[PDB]
Design a protein around this ligand. Structure first.
Ligand SMILES: O=C(O)c1ccc(-c2nn(C(=O)c3c(Cl)cccc3C(F)(F)F)c3ccccc23)cc1
Ligand SMILES: [Mg+2]
Length: 243
């Protein structure tokens, strides 16, 4: 792919990203001052496990749905057979959700933006997932240290999804090519901005995968104990994770 194609791919990917973000980043930064009372905290901490899970589960569900809309706008994704779109999304939608979190994370006070204000991990205590939730906070913190631009997150998460080494693909070669193109675009943009050095500092893909595995497993257990009701946007994908 030539320079102009690459530039068009970067612009396209970053526009798709911005347009499939729940909240714009300026909002998240405006509100880092708006922090939860200890009264508001204990309020959340005195919530029942189920009502808290319902909140978080619906929040996370909505997030996955924005990520699916992002994928559907990646050049070439819609041209993929339904099987492969499910393979890519089953594996990666939640990996992207986990990456997108670093936006709502404030490494200064170690808090995250949740339901209108910032709170520490203490806020989710009623779920009793301290291990998992501590891990997630560690990951966001780790991503914070890289000071991603919005453009970098867009290209990085595009590559999290468009990965040709996911088990199950049938058009593996078509994915390899969309991936190659996204890698040229990511690398170009990083060079352009003197940020090429972050490539070696990105999370090892294994760490992202395994963390996503822990997280989804836990969520599936909770979905078993206490099903929330989902109006699904990609039914063949929903059926692949909720059954
Ligand atoms: O609306 C949809 O079409 C749709 C909506 C959501 C998903 C989706 N949920 N999910 C979960 O982890 C999940 C969530 Cl976010 C909330 C409650 C329970 C669950 C669980 F049971 F599946 F585990 C995923 C993981 C990986 C990939 C896609 C998804 C998929 C499809
Ligand atoms: Mg240069």
């Amino acid at each position: 792919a030539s320079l102009t194609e690459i530039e068009h791919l970067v612009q396209s990917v970053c526009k798709s990203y911005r347009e499939t973000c729940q909240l714009r980043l300026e909002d998240l930064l405006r509100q880092r001052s708006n922090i939860f009372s200890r009264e508001e905290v204990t309020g959340y901490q005195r919530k029942s496990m189920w009502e808290m899970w319902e909140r978080c589960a619906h929040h996370l569900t909505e997030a996955i749905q924005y990520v699916v809309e992002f994928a559907k706008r990646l050049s070439g994704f819609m041209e993929l057979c339904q099987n492969d779109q499910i393979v890519l999304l089953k594996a990666g939608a939640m990996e992207v959700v986990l990456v997108r979190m670093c936006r709502a994370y404030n490494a200064d006070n170690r808090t995250v933006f949740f339901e209108g204000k910032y709170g520490g991990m203490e806020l989710f205590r009623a779920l009793g997932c301290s291990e998992l939730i501590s891990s997630i906070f560690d990951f966001s913190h780790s991503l914070s240290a890289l000071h991603f631009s919005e453009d970098e997150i867009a290209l990085y998460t595009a590559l999290v999804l468009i990965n040709a080494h996911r088990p199950g693909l049938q058009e593996k070669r078509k994915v390899e090519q969309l991936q190659y193109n996204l890698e040229l675009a990511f690398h170009h943009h990083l060079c352009k901005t003197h940020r090429q050095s972050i490539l070696a500092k990105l999370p090892p893909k294994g760490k992202l995968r395994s963390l996503c595995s822990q997280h989804v497993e836990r969520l599936q257990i909770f979905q078993h104990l206490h099903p929330i009701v989902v109006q699904a946007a990609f039914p063949p994908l929903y059926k692949e994770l909720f059954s």
